[PDB]
Design an enzyme around this catalytic site. Structure first.
Site: not given
Ligand SMILES: [Zn+2]
Ligand SMILES: [Ca+2]
Ligand SMILES: [Ca+2]
Ligand SMILES: [Ca+2]
Ligand SMILES: [Ca+2]
Lengths: 6, 532, 6
Positions: B402-403, B406
């Site tokens: 997830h990160e 990003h």
């Molecule tokens: Zn996030």
């Protein structure tokens, strides 16, 4: 705010 | 067997019969009951009558715990909770002096400082009520007594540790209490008791270390009162704590607790801990693992196999990201963030203790991405994460994928730094991080359709971080992004053409057109998804 | 910065 349930 | 109808009554005597027969477990339902129940159950008359009965029953208490008194004090503090959060409920002015009377009677009982789990259960509700009712100014000496009387035998009992730990919430809540703040600056005995409690080395590595850490934390808060007569004792106690314990190692929760609050009101040079964060980052994230010339890991305690699985999955996600987002591997303008640093603590607890000091971040979340300024040559973005047993194998780094997305989204899709957009992009940033990393594996996203509460595309696009509505941000952000990739991938690239150039007004007009044109299709799509 | 879900 005040403390919730335990 | 809990029937909340019994509390919806107008006779104080039936109310207390409900409290005593149904018990604390059922009274617990009053915190989340409809306003009809709460307005009936929490009248000023009910609260005065319960408080006066509780007072007399507490005067007769002879130790060993009390299911009835546990329920009565729970009801009383449940009332203050409902009065705070229910606009239909406002207590008359004689309610609180009576509640204070009910509390006073338990406190003045010869059994107040008794030991044992059964006593701890009622004592817990009494100490919480002191905070719930705004009585923190009235029980400062109770805080001092418990801190002075505490010993290893009280510490044997889970419910005594839990109950007495509430004295630190009292000090924390007293900040909003004008009577408390007029008094606290004189409480030299309390300050002495607080420092003695936290400097007790037998608490380190024990089930009471968390109380010693809370003691240090509340003492650090009293650094606020720079001109008060307690200030020399506060300073001396903080200085003793900072010298006795390490910022990383056994007992660092006590060190970091004190540093957290004291740094808010006093300069680091007051305690000669200026620049401690550099050494702490090096102690806490002591491992180095080089994934490639564009990704490096600093971590607290991962195995080589975990390091290898993280690097491999990030290499995999990178490739899948560029193909799926059709980047041509070309970053947005003014972005020099070719290199990334990944910072991984050993647990959420470790993340909670160390990441705030090291990175200056809020830690009430599952990780964080810090893009910095991409236009600065030499900027290195960071994401910060922790290992979790429930994270993905084989790295078991929570939100690793997830990160990382990003970072990729921030470099290849979103012009500017994090604060740059002039239109909301939360739905996209969080939705694409979830969709690229999860693809079609998102049970919770299906479940939030099946439960019947849904959002329109327009609502998804207007999602903010305010109140951190995880369901709206992450699940519905995921659903809209997945829908657009599956059904309108040409529109996604059209939108990305706007975001990659920082054309935020144009981006907003594009997706507001989606919210009008595609809403029925999205509605049918989520329905089909929820079916199977 | 953008937070990860708990
Ligand atoms: Zn996030
Ligand atoms: Ca109210
Ligand atoms: Ca580990
Ligand atoms: Ca960017
Ligand atoms: Ca829902």
């Amino acid at each position: 705010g005040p403390p919730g349930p335990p | 067997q809990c029937d909340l109808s019994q509390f919806q009554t107008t006779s104080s005597n039936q109310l207390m019969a409900a409290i005593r027969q149904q018990g604390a477990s059922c009274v617990n339902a009053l915190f989340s009951a409809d306003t009809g129940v709460q307005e009936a159950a929490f009248s000023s008359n009910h609260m005065y009558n319960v408080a006066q009965y509780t007072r007399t029953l507490a005067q007769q208490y002879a130790g060993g715990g009390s299911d009835e008194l546990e329920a009565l004090y729970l009801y009383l503090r449940a009332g203050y909770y409902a009065e705070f959060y229910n606009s239909n409920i406002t207590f008359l002015s004689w309610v609180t002096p009576a509640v204070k009377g009910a509390v006073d009677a338990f406190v003045q009982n010869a059994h107040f400082y008794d030991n044992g789990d059964a006593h701890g259960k009622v004592l817990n509700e009494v100490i919480i009520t002191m905070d719930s009712a705004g009585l923190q100014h009235a029980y400062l000496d109770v805080v001092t007594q418990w801190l002075t009387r505490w010993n290893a035998q009280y510490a044997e009992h889970w419910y005594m540790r839990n109950a007495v730990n509430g004295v630190f919430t009292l000090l924390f809540g007293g900040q909003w209490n004008n009577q408390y703040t007029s008094l606290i600056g004189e409480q030299t005995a309390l300050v002495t008791a607080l420092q003695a409690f936290a400097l007790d080395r037998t608490k380190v590595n024990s089930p009471t270390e968390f109380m010693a850490a809370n003691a240090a934390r509340e003492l650090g808060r009293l650094a606020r009162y720079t001109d008060a007569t307690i200030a020399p004792k506060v300073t001396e106690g903080l200085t003793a704590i900072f010298g006795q314990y390490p910022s990383y190692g056994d007992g660092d929760a006590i060190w970091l607790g004190a540093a957290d609050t004291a740094s808010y009101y006093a300069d680091c040079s007051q305690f000669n801990i200026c620049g401690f964060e550099d050494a702490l980052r090096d102690a806490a994230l002591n491992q180095t693992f080089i994934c490639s010339d564009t990704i490096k890991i600093r971590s607290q305690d991962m195995s080589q196999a975990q390091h290898l699985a993280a690097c491999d999955k990030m290499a995999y996600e990178e490739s899948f990201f560029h193909t799926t987002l059709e980047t041509g591997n070309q970053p947005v303008a003014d972005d020099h963030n070719t290199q990334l640093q990944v910072n991984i603590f050993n647990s959420d607890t470790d993340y909670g203790k160390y990441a705030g000091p090291i990175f200056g971040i809020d830690t009430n979340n599952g990780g964080m991405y810090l893009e910095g300024n991409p236009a600065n040559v030499g900027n290195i973005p960071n994401f910060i994460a922790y290992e979790a047993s429930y994270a993905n194998p084989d790295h078991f780094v929570w939100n690793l994928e997830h990160e990382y997305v990003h970072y990729l989204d921030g470099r290849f899709n979103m012009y500017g730094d994090f604060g740059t957009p002039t239109e909301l992009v939360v739905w996209w940033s969080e939705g694409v991080a979830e969709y690229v990393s999860r693809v079609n594996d998102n049970p919770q996203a299906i479940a939030t359709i099946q439960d019947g509460s849904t959002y329109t595309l327009a609502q998804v696009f207007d999602t903010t971080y305010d109140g951190f509505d995880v369901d709206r941000i992450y699940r519905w952000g995921y659903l809209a992004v997945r829908f657009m990739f599956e059904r309108h991938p040409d529109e996604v690239q059209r939108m990305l053409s706007a975001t990659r150039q920082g054309r935020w007004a144009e981006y907003k007009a594009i997706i507001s057109g989606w919210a009008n044109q595609y809403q029925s299709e999205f509605a049918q799509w989520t329905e089909a998804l929820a079916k199977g």
